């Protein structure tokens, strides 16, 4: 009931009591661990007030006013508001608190040392896709900050009956298109080929190239979604060069500076925000390892190893590993030389350990998903590899949700 | 009750029903996943026959004679033998079956495609530490096979009352010593500094250098353990050179060819074999990444990056990643050029996926520990990174056990 986590590189032991406040379930049981399963698995008023009370208790605790009169009146105000409408509305303060803590609770996020430096854009007054576009543009502009990236979240109206959901159909605000070729191969990003076609179906005119920034597909109040093109001046892009290899330019790679997830669901006090695009900055490996080198993504290890003139006959020459490291030095160098915020996996993972120590100290724990926290290369030469982590579900939280096209009464 | 695991690089889905035969518990609950905890947590006759029956049922099932007369008579023979002595003895056939399946069930072992090619040395007639030494030497000689390594396990008498355990006090049959220096630094292997001292306490005369192969500390029938020096001619060693960098020789690194774990407990049919050294061959990264580059092991990344003349000022130059890849090419090249069996993490992890497909097909599943199966470098450019795995505990099994010195009535 007071669980211990050890770091096997420092012999440091932290004690977790925060997992006692855990509410949702993990997918694991006493007899099966599902910690490597990628995805593990309308509301009513009878369930809502417990969720609202729990959240309001932690909100008022966090401002040194747990159990005060203002707390009780808010509790009663929300209870009575749930009585009337079978839902309720968060204060601006509660909304900002909840969003920050959904990030704080994201066990898969190695970047949480920054969790309290989060800029919350309240878009709950939005009514139309055009409003969404506007709000999203201002998010991109603010978050990008001329390369001095700033963490931000934009929060559209909460789910009501379910058939009036706000949704951003893009998986990220900024992603590159993906088209299948006549010869079956893929140009651009294979991950987005279905979404790229959905935009063509709703009317996108595609410049069938590699790094074509997709338009936005914005659904407002459950209506059919609508296409919008982010102004190109708002899309900061980094050309990828290597500090040593000059042919690396000829590779002609570029990536966007702003990672901004837009397909997740923000849960606060039992309220569901189905459209809550949030952005930070990149860890290098997301681009250099996963985006560029996943076999189902840009899959460039072939080309880079060629230009390096590596022994590609044998798997055991580690030509793949050697090219992988060169690519990630190139992503980092290119972003830093452009003053565009980025963090290498060593800096990021060290900060997460430090963040973990803070959370165990001032909060009694830190939910953490080792499978996701350990970078996709150089695992054990980063300190998180050696860090036991307890994974558990705390709320407020970011949740996955079905893709909108699979569910939307169209 | 019929769980699905997906590979997110191939879109391949396998169905696991084998987890239903799972017996022991994982450490995880519905509310907390402990999949990154490194260690998760005398017998009686009233518990033994269930364990014996379960095992004998699976043994006789596996030879197409489940429920036959020979099965029932063995079941009755073992029941009556447990009645008399409150324990029982395995047939040679059952012992070999159990050991192979303890390996087959080792969810942390990426090497299980080989699980049925296991050479079982029955040492249950051993009575003394000298017998153990002899048996262990023959294991080393056979397994090493002039570099054409062969998987083997040597199985000493099962635990009886508990105070007559056979134990190999070494964590591996072959490991390098570790001594702390006058200036506090460590020479050799920091992992073994406590064990190295224990040998000095029991009488080892140490050649205080780096790669000094430790003696054996063998405990027989619960008596005090005794030191033995493996004949050096039996300890195959590989000098580490690089196919490109000639200074890599000046690094003066060498490792032993035979990885042979000796501190684990083999559980078969509820019987406990506390001394069961088993050996295979190395995956390159065990040496090149963990042994050489863990900060708490040989910690050589410093030196290698120096000789490579790498930018070590910035963490973000990835000098560590770049030196790490060079080291692992050197370990692989050096072993292969010496015809000493080794497998690179690409070959090994590909074979494990293939092994997984076999087990789901012909067995309904394959227990697998993603945290341990994914190599410590180049994670996502190997196929296991993308492979959902269910972890669960099947028996026969290899279990951790306390270090003998912490428990032994001395
Ligand atoms: C500020 C810099 C940030 C960094 C360096 C960072 C880093 C990361 C990385 C590398 C991942 C793994 C993503 C993947 O592999 O696909 C991740 C996951 C995640 N991040 Fe962060 N992040 C940052 C900011 C944020 C912010 C501002 C939020 C929310 C407000 C957030 C919420 C999450 C969530 C919910 C996940 C889990 C995604 C999933 O399960 O698919 N992060 N983070
Ligand atoms: C034949 C070649 C083999 C290869 C390439 C291989 C590979 C590996 C590797 C890389 C690990 C992780 C070890 C670590 O990181 O410390 C491991 C773990 C393990 N292996 Fe294998 N192995 C082989 C043979 C065997 C054999 C013959 C057995 C038993 C008869 C075995 C049983 C185990 C067990 C029980 C573990 C888990 C150890 C733990 O939890 O600490 N392996 N294997
Ligand atoms: N720095 C960042 N990064 C980051 C953070 C959170 C989440 C993500 C993206 N998380 C997506 C992982 C994912 C999800 C689904 C599928 C998938 C779904 C259906 C079919 C096939 C694949 C594949 C992947 C990645 N392979 C990136 C930030 C972006 C915004 C703030 S921080
Ligand atoms: N190819 C091989 N390899 C392999 C396979 C199985 C197990 C192992 C060694 N598994 C040890 C992992 C471990 C355990 C304990 C501690 C530890 C304990 C107390 C204090 C500090 C550390 C540290 C580590 C590694 N960091 C290697 C083979 C050897 C034999 C057959 S196959
Ligand atoms: C099967 C496995 O869960 C899947 O590949 C996970 C592994 N860890 C990951 N970790 C991060 N950060 N991002 C990912 O997409 C994944 N993928
Ligand atoms: C904390 C964490 O569980 C620990 O570092 C694990 C991670 N995965 C591992 N995987 C292997 N193969 N060997 C290890 O020693 C470890 N260490
Ligand atoms: Zn688990």
From Swiss-Prot, chains A, B:
Localisation per UniProt entry: Cell membrane, Sarcolemma; Cell projection, Dendritic spine
Binding residues annotated for L-arginine, in chain numbering: 172, 281-282, 286
Top-level lineage group: Eukaryota
Disulfide pattern: none
Coiled coil: none
Binding-site residues, (6R)-L-erythro-5,6,7,8-tetrahydrobiopterin: 36, 371-372, 385
Effect of residue 282 to S: 30% decrease of nitric-oxide synthase activity
Residues bound to heme b: 109, 400
Maturation and modification: Ubiquitinated; mediated by STUB1/CHIP in the presence of Hsp70 and Hsp40 (in vitro).
Tissues expressing this chain: Isoform N-NOS-1 is expressed in brain and colorectum. Found in the Auerbach's plexus of the enteric nervous system. Isoform PNNOS is expressed in the penis, urethra, prostate, and skeletal muscle, and coexists with the cerebellar nnos in the pelvic plexus, bladder and liver, and is detectable in the cerebellum.
Protein family membership: Belongs to the NOS family.
Function: Produces nitric oxide (NO) which is a messenger molecule with diverse functions throughout the body. In the brain and peripheral nervous system, NO displays many properties of a neurotransmitter. Inhibitory transmitter for non-adrenergic and non-cholinergic nerves in the colorectum. Probably has nitrosylase activity and mediates cysteine S-nitrosylation of cytoplasmic target proteins such SRR. Inhibitory transmitter for non-adrenergic and non-cholinergic nerves in the colorectum.
Record note on quaternary structure: Homodimer. Interacts with DLG4 (via N-terminal tandem pair of PDZ domains); the interaction possibly being prevented by the association between NOS1 and CAPON. Forms a ternary complex with CAPON and RASD1. Forms a ternary complex with CAPON and SYN1. Interacts with ZDHHC23. Interacts with NOSIP; which may impair its synaptic location. Interacts with HTR4. Interacts with SLC6A4. Interacts with VAC14.
Domain remark text: The PDZ domain participates in protein-protein interaction, and is responsible for targeting nNos to synaptic membranes. Mediates interaction with VAC14.
Name this protein carries in UniProt: Nitric oxide synthase 1
Gene field: Nos1
């Amino acid at each position: 009931r007071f669980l211990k986590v050890k770091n096997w590189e420092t012999d440091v032991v932290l004690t977790d009591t925060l997992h006692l406040k855990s509410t949702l379930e993990t997918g694991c049981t006493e007899h099966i661990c599902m910690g490597s399963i990628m995805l593990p698995s309308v509301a009513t008023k009878d369930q809502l007030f417990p969720l609202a009370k729990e959240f309001l208790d932690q909100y008022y605790s966090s401002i040194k006013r747990f159990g005060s009169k203002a707390h009780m009146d808010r509790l009663e105000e929300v209870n009575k508001e749930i009585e009337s409408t079978s839902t309720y509305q968060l204060k601006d303060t509660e909304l900002i608190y909840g969003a920050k803590h959904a990030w704080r609770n994201a066990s898969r996020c190695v970047g949480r040392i920054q969790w309290s430096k989060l800029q919350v854009f309240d878009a709950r007054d939005c009514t139309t896709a055009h409003g969404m576009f506007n709000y999203i543009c201002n998010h991109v502009k603010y978050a990008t900050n001329k390369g001095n990236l700033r963490s931000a979240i934009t929060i559209f109206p909460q789910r009501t009956d379910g058939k009036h959901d706000f949704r951003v159909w893009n998986s990220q605000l900024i992603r590159y298109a993906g088209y299948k070729q006549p010869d079956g191969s893929t140009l651009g990003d294979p991950a987005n080929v279905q979404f790229t076609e959905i935009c063509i179906q709703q009317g996108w005119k595609a410049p069938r190239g590699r790094f074509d920034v997709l338009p936005l597909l914005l659904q407002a109040n459950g209506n059919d979604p609508e296409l919008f093109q982010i102004p190109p001046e708002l899309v900061l892009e980094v050309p990828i060069r290597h500090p040593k290899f000059d042919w690396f330019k000829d590779l002609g790679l570029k990536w966007y500076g702003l990672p901004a997830v837009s397909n997740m669901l923000l849960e606060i006090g039992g309220l569901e925000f189905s459209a809550c695009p949030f952005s930070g900055w990149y860890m290098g490996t997301e681009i250099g390892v996963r985006d560029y080198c996943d076999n189902s993504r840009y899959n460039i290890l072939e080309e880079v190893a060629k230009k390096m003139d590596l022994d590609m006959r044998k798997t055991s020459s580690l030509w793949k590993d050697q090219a992988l490291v060169e690519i990630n030095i190139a992503v980092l160098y290119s972003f830093q030389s452009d003053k565009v915020t980025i963090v290498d996996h060593h800096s990021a993972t060290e900060s997460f350990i430090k963040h973990m120590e803070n959370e165990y100290r001032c909060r009694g724990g830190c939910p953490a998903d080792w499978v996701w926290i350990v970078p996709p290369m150089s695992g054990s030469i980063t300190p998180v590899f050696h860090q036991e982590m307890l994974n558990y579900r705390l709320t407020p939280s970011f949740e996955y949700q079905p893709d909108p096209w699979n569910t939307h009464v169209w």
